[PDB]
């Protein structure tokens, strides 16, 4: 399958909390991870609310899942040590908590401990960058950073040093990374993540890599654009890894100014359309300029955000279907499978 045609993880993010997605009740979801990748990412379980139960720590999920992989030919990457999300925070990551830095401490040291040897690399901390797109309690930008509780509390970025600082000290094995999306526009996004990214190196903070979630439509951005991304981080350093670890490419451009070029219809990409065809392209040519622009020895992973299509994110989003993913609803393999297959080949 997939995996076999590199040298780096290709990998897949599994859901894990019920419904027709779950891993652990699809035999066929089992069947095409065993087949096609070699890493899983949690979609869902490993964010940080769910390293809890009650007020007391529990990993009998994330550790069932994490087990799974072991057994069944999968690395895990863990998402995510720190996300801003109100959905999963602890209770302890309150502006109420007195004792906030102490209970940080305590959840990074205690989940990378835990994990130590069975999860090959975090995202250490996701989404730290202000998006306007993703600014919900309209808090605004500082200096390009987003303002959730970690950096209220922390009074700045400096959180996500102590971040790295800490999960390497748990677990010295662990590849960390930190983790974004719309950064592989090149637009304003991509300069906010050069600030963070060469300030977390002047500071000398245990950085291993970043990933780019890449949730990408069929014509934007731009593939240049894309490529020049990812090649502004890597020239930040010799050694830093990049990762795409959330890629999936919607037919639908909402926001383009274009209502006429909208697959409205459920039925419209069932069998075929251009749309399929081009995401064929698309996937192929951003496989290519991870290739070209990561060098050997760099490359982190490839992971798509979910197996078949109805499980998506992206399924529906903004009233429209969508259809993301390498397999579809009776979980065949679509263009876009080919896609990747002929870009890892070369
Ligand atoms: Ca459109």
């Not at 009998?60 to 040590?81: E, K, M």
């Amino acid at each position: 399958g997939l995996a076999s045609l590199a040298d780096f993880p290709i990998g897949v993010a599994v859901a894990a909390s019920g419904g027709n997605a779950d891993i652990f009740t699809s035999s066929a979801r089992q069947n095409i991870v065993r087949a096609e990748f070699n890493q899983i990412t949690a979609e869902n379980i490993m964010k940080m609310s769910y390293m809890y139960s009650g007020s007391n720590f529990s990993f009998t999920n994330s550790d069932r899942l994490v087990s799974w992989a072991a057994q069944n030919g999968q690395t895990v990457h863990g998402h995510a040590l720190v996300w801003h999300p109100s959905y999963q925070l602890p209770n302890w990551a309150s502006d109420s908590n007195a004792n906030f830095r102490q209970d940080f401490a305590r959840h990074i040291d205690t989940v990378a401990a835990h994990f130590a040897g069975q999860v090959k690399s975090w995202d250490v901390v996701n989404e730290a960058l202000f998006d306007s797109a993703d600014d919900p309690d309209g808090r605004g930008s500082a200096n390009g950073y987003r303002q959730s509780v970690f950096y209220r509390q922390f009074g700045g970025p400096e959180y996500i040093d102590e971040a790295f600082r800490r999960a390497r000290a748990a677990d010295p094995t662990a590849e960390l990374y930190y983790n974004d999306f719309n950064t592989e526009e090149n637009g304003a996004k991509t300069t906010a993540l050069v600030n963070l990214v060469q300030r977390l190196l002047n500071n000398g903070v245990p950085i291993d890599g970043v990933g780019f979630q890449m949730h990408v439509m069929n014509d934007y951005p731009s593939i240049a654009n894309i490529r020049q991304a990812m090649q502004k981080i890597v020239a930040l350093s010799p050694t830093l890894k990049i990762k795409i670890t959330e890629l999936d490419v919607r037919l639908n451009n909402p926001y383009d100014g274009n209502s006429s070029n909208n697959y409205t219809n459920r039925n419209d990409c069932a069998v075929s359309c251009a749309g399929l065809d081009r995401q064929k392209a698309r996937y192929k040519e951003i496989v290519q300029a991870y290739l070209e622009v990561v060098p050997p020895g760099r490359r982190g992973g490839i992971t798509v955000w979910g197996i078949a299509d109805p499980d998506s994110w992206l399924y529906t989003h903004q009233n429209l279907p969508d259809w993301p993913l390498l397999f579809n609803d009776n979980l065949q393999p679509k263009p876009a499978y080919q896609g990747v297959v002929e870009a890892l080949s070369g």
